Design a protein. Structure first.
Lengths: 199, 199, 199, 199
């Protein structure tokens, strides 16, 4: 409950910033919405608290909390639990609101994403609507190829996501090369399903 | 209003430091002036507050706040909004007082500047007074050439500025090479207007 | 005694996190146990406090506190006190609970360990039980060879340990090459005692 | 005066640490002495406070505070004021007590020192007593040659010092190569005065 306190003072700081910068009504709305969904009335130093513990405990926990994510994700579900653990360790949580552009075709990409809860759409130059849902991932292709985002990804609903930064994606994939081919294979299918080809 | 509180305690800390170091009257004046102009009676953790939000929101906002800057700047105004966004993300705000030397001819340079509000003068070995004003930029040439500051830049008024550090200038220019030629071209004109030439 | 205060509020933060994440009874138990053993009712900013001091003092102290460790460790005990000092400077303290897997055969390794108090067991594919105790070290082999953990290490009791990260192991071993051969030699004996061979 | 408060609570934290670690009487004495001399009853966040200001102001100030240091130091006194400014920017303050070993012959070196107030002695294998005093510097030779400390430096009195870390020494010397030869020359004389020779 110290945290249901922090929450309301932080959102008081937020409101101030908005005032000083004179942001428009529907933009203050947008930001207020996101806050509720992002923090849901509570704020605490997740990271700090895990830092006080050792690895074994840190790994039991992350494994427990991400239990449904691992289980509904063919790639994780069917993998070396240790790879899973490595991966889960480096995920950072994120929230997107409906109509947000998580990824823009063209852009340079430094992150990939795991869908916890939500629906998201894959768009190219008239590739129709391709939907990804819980236990799906996107944003891998860019990272592998070191070239540019091969399509745009828009949030169709509120999207609860876990993201993995490029350095982290590569550190882990250094340790588990077998798991690179796993990514690569689904990526060639994805590029094959839309009609693209890459070096 | 928590921030109109912080302000006055921070400037109380400042006054103490000055006392312990026995700084002269007109130097304490100079520092007091700058404080008022730099913070204008208020202090808050801009960065912190943007960190709690996601990218879409962070980008809407920075775009809104820098609206006049983008619009009065041929280079930004006539560019890929995404390049603009990339750029705006990495700008840090700065204040200079009249007669300050923002850049010294000769020096190694690690920053460039965008004039928000103010007037500034370009000086070389008898190149007269060349003035840059709102929606102008300077300090690019050094960064491009990786050699030394090609002229001095003095603040003729109070100058409100946004600066961009070298690593950031290059990260963005990696992503938008077309925009490098834009810089390069105005730079050759600038060196041509004063009579200099560089590898 | 400010620290016997901090302790109880921090463990209050811990309890909250557990609640919000709905961790199971024996896992909250496990975490509560570790806390007592790890901090033993008290928390203070060891690092912070050493940072205020200079090197000479920082070195006297670390030498004093690690007095029994150095003295019961053939490798340290019989070495250049300065090497010892360098080493001791970079050790970070850690606690493991009985049945924890400190190191997993196969894994990539970024740390090595010094046993202060406790017993630990070395396991391979039917290599029986090999026990290491106070003033022993393990996890060196991986670091030297830059290849993978050559066996698993499990905590048989509560284990009080000091660990040394790879960068630190190498920085020091750059300065004291003679001391590399010391490590290398015991490592070849260790690999010889279990029947393994490495490039 | 907020700072004459902080001081006494910090030294209360220090006392606690000592108790928990059961340090000997003359070692608690040694640490208490140093505290008085190092902070002299007051503590404040020098760095923090300079961070709020811009460069021009930051440079005026550091120049003012180090006025006697620059003026009694042939190397600084007779140099490009800008080089001086660059240098002064990166100095960190340090205190040593009588009989401390600031530098040990043999060791790898990552710092050099400027004597503000104090006396210090240069020792080799029977090179007698060579004393350096206010406006002198030492620890340069190592940094230049990238090899090892060429002699030991002991504090003969309480020594008030400013130190410059290797990266910083090189960054500045990149910008002012002329000033490298200045260092190099005095270094060859120093090695010539004791009878040593180096690649
Ligand atoms: N056929 C597909 N089905 C689902 N998702 C896709 C498909 N093709 C591309 N994507 C995703 O859209 C992402 C756009 O960014 P990336 O190129 O980094 O990675 C791309 C894929 O992860
Ligand atoms: N002809 C010009 N008109 C306006 N500004 C200039 C001109 N020439 C040089 N400058 C600016 O002065 C700056 C001095 O530092 P730089 O060499 O980094 O970059 C230089 C330019 O940005
Ligand atoms: N014969 C042995 N006796 C004791 N410890 C060992 C022996 N062989 C290996 N180990 C330790 O087990 C560790 C497993 O990880 P490393 O390969 O990094 O380093 C290994 C050694 O430090
Ligand atoms: N002849 C000398 N007179 C004064 N100081 C010296 C002399 N020779 C060496 N020193 C200092 O002692 C220092 C020992 O460490 P360094 O080799 O890094 O740098 C050395 C010099 O800065």
């Amino acid at each position: 409950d110290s945290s249901r306190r922090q929450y309301q003072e932080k959102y008081k700081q937020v409101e101030q910033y908005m005032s000083f910068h004179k942001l428009p009504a529907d933009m203050r709305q947008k930001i207020h919405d996101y806050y509720e969904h992002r923090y849901q009335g509570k704020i605490f130093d997740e990271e700090n608290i895990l830092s006080e513990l050792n690895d074994p405990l840190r790994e039991e926990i992350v494994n427990f909390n991400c239990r449904k994510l691992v289980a509904t994700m063919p790639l994780f579900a069917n993998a070396d639990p240790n790879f899973v653990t490595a991966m889960l360790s480096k995920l950072r949580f994120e929230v997107f609101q409906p109509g947000d552009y998580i990824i823009r075709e063209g852009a340079v990409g430094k992150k990939m994403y795991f869908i916890q809860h939500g629906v998201a759409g894959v768009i190219t130059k008239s590739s129709k609507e391709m939907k990804l849902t819980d236990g799906s991932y996107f944003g891998e292709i860019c990272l592998l190829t070191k070239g540019r985002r091969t399509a745009s990804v828009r949030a169709d609903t509120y999207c609860r996501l876990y993201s993995l930064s490029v350095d982290n994606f590569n550190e882990v994939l250094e340790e588990y090369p077998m798991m690179r081919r796993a990514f690569e294979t689904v990526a060639i299918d994805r590029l094959d399903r839309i009609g693209k080809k890459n070096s």
